[PDB]
Amino acid sequence: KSKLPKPVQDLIKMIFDVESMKKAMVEYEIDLQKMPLGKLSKRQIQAAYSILSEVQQAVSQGSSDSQILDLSNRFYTLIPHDFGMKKPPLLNNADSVQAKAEMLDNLLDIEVAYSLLRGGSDDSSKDPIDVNYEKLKTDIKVVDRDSEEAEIIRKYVKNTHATTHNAYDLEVIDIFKIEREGECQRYKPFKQLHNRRLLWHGSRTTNFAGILSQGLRIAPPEAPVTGYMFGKGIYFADMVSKSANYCHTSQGDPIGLILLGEVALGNMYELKHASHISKLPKGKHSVKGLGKTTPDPSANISLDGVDVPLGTGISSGVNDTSLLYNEYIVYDIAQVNLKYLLKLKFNFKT
Ligand SMILES: Cc1cnc(N2CCN(CCCc3nc4c(Cl)cccc4c(=O)[nH]3)CC2)n1C
């Protein structure tokens, strides 16, 4: 029997659940009879990204539906979908490419989680929770509810839920302080950079074994750059509800996970609309997608020398922008230092 605290044991069970991995793949319309969990590989995912890039080029060249058919079919040959003896839907537009790129990003984290479960040793005398915990190479500790850091974190959740995201309310169940092995050392060239901020990152429950073991990663070179609003980087929000939407929780699964990370933004490149960039302009360290609403800047507080934008939402003064709320993007994995992990209960009003 494990000596780990009960909330840590529940987190490990949740993140390594095989049935949840299968459920995420069904949601993606993947044919599990043709492509089961165990048959998924890095090689196949990479080849699928490369076919999406071929679809992206054909779309930008203004190719007809008859011309795109062979390229669309190629993607389905690599990643089999659930359609029986029917023709699959045509991937003839930008929205299609973006939906499929997002699915492949998720498959990469699911493949990592399954590879950890299969690639080790079997010993019945050890508690499986302890065995799976060690595979994460992350120190996980419970933050005391009555502590100062828990008070600041609860305030950030309470103040940054947008009015436009009123389909649900959030309840903080557990707060974990996290320390990925070697991340602190990796972050050292950016530890004293200006504009360091504590920001949110929401993701499906099935991605968290991949995130804790490998950290937050950028889409690979094979991936189509137009399938990402501001190119291939790591995306964050200053509004808890903007990131919580990306947990993809529902009435049938109302528990989700969210990260709080220290991001070294430095000199920000401020944008109002889509820009599928390969590299940042000289002297820039990040992208700031300018939102119509921003947390109140006079309510900005400091937690261990890092700025926490926990103010209530007010007008930014920015006109004619495609974003309702801010977003922040970094293009170097070393610019992120993961600090906390929150387990949230979603109370749906719909
Ligand atoms: C190689 C690799 C491994 N796993 C990945 N994926 C997995 C999927 N994950 C989705 C992130 C979702 C998200 N999007 C946001 C946007 Cl678009 C704006 C503002 C905030 C957010 C936010 O909090 N979460 C991306 C990384 N990749 C690319």
Cα distance between residue 303 and residue 257, in whole Å: 21
Nearest CA to ligand 1 atom 5: 105
Method of elucidation: X-ray
Residue 161's φ and ψ, nearest 5 degrees, are -95, 115
Ligand 1 centroid, distance to 263 Cα (angstroms): 15
Binding residues for NAD(+): 201-203, 210, 217, 243
Q: What is the largest CA-CA distance in the chain?
A: 63
Which of 49, 157, 170, 201 gets mutated to test ligand 1 (max ligand atoms within 8 A of its CB)?
201
Q: Report the candidate in 310, 302, 169 with the shortest Cα–Cα distance to residue 237.
A: 310
Residue with tokens 């507080």: 301
C-alpha of residue 84 to centroid of ligand 1, in Å: 31
Mutation pick for ligand 1 pocket among 115, 165, 203 (CB with most ligand atoms within 8 Å): 203
Angstrom distances, CA of residue 149 to CA of 145, 154, 183, 307, 344 = 9, 9, 21, 13, 17
For residue 308 the two structure tokens come to 């926490």
User: Which residues are known catalytic residues?
Assistant: 327
Helix 6-15 and helix 128-135: axis angle, to 10°? 70
| 263, 92 contact by CB (below 8 A) | no
Measured CA to CA, the distance from residue 186 to residue 189 in angstroms comes to 8
Atom of ligand 1 minimally distant from the CA of 258: 23
Per the DSSP assignment, residues forming a β-bridge with 198 are 262
Rounded CA Rg of the chain:
21
Tell me the domains of the chain and their CATH numbers.
Answer: 6-122+127-135 (1.20.142.10), 136-348 (3.90.228.10)
Nearest CA to ligand 1 atom 11: 203
Nearest CA to ligand 1 atom 26: 105
Backbone angles phi, psi at 289, to 5 degrees: -80, 110
Looking at the DSSP bridge assignments, the partners of residue 244 are none
Contact partners, residue 150, CB within 8 Å, separation at least 6: 143, 144, 175
Ligand 1 centroid vs 350 CA: distance in angstroms?
26
CA 333 to centroid of ligand 1, rounded, Å? 13
- Secondary structure string (H, E, C) spanning the chain: CCCCCHHHHHHHHHHCCHHHHHHHHHHCCECCCCCCHHHCCHHHHHHHHHHHHHHHHHHHCCCCHHHHHHHHHHHHHHCCECCCCCCCCCCCCHHHHHHHHHHHHHHHHHHHHHHHHHCCCCCCCCCHHHHHHHHCCEEEEECCCCCHHHHHHHHHHHHCCCHHHCCEEEEEEEEEEEEECCHHHHHHHHCCCCCEEEEEEEECHHHHHHHHHHCCCCCCCCCCHHHCCCCCCEEEECCHHHHHHHHCCECCECEEEEEEEEEECCCEEEECCCCCCCCCCCCCCEEEECEEEEECHHHCEEECCEEECCCCEEECCCCCCCEEECEEEECCHHHEEEEEEEEEEEEECC
For this entry, resolution in Å reads: 2.0
Cα(87) to ligand 1 centroid in Å equals: 30
Report the separation in Å between the CA atom of 349 and the middle of ligand 1, taken as the mean of its atom positions.
Answer: 26
How far is CA 5 from each of CA 2, 12, 176, 210, rounded to the nearest angstrom?
A: 8, 11, 11, 22
Measured from CB, residues less than 6 Å from any atom of ligand 1 are 105-106, 108-109, 200-203, 207, 217, 219, 235-237, 242-243, 246, 327
Please tell me the distance from the alpha carbon of residue 208 to that of residue 224, in angstroms, as a whole number: 24
By CB neighbour count within 10 A (0-12 exposed, 13-18 middle, 19+ buried), where does 62 fall?
A: exposed
Q: Per DSSP, what are the bridge partners of residue 81?
A: 30
* Partners of 329 in beta bridges: 235, 287
Mutational pocket test of ligand 1: of 206, 217, 324, 329, the residue with most ligand atoms within 8 Å of the beta carbon: 217
Instruction: Take atom 25 of ligand 1 and give the residue whose Cα is closest.
Output: 105
Breaks (C-N over 2.5 A) in the chain follow: none
CA distance 160 to 80: 40
Q: Which atom of ligand 1 is nearest to the CA of 201?
A: 23
Beta bridge partners of residue 96, listed in sequence order: none
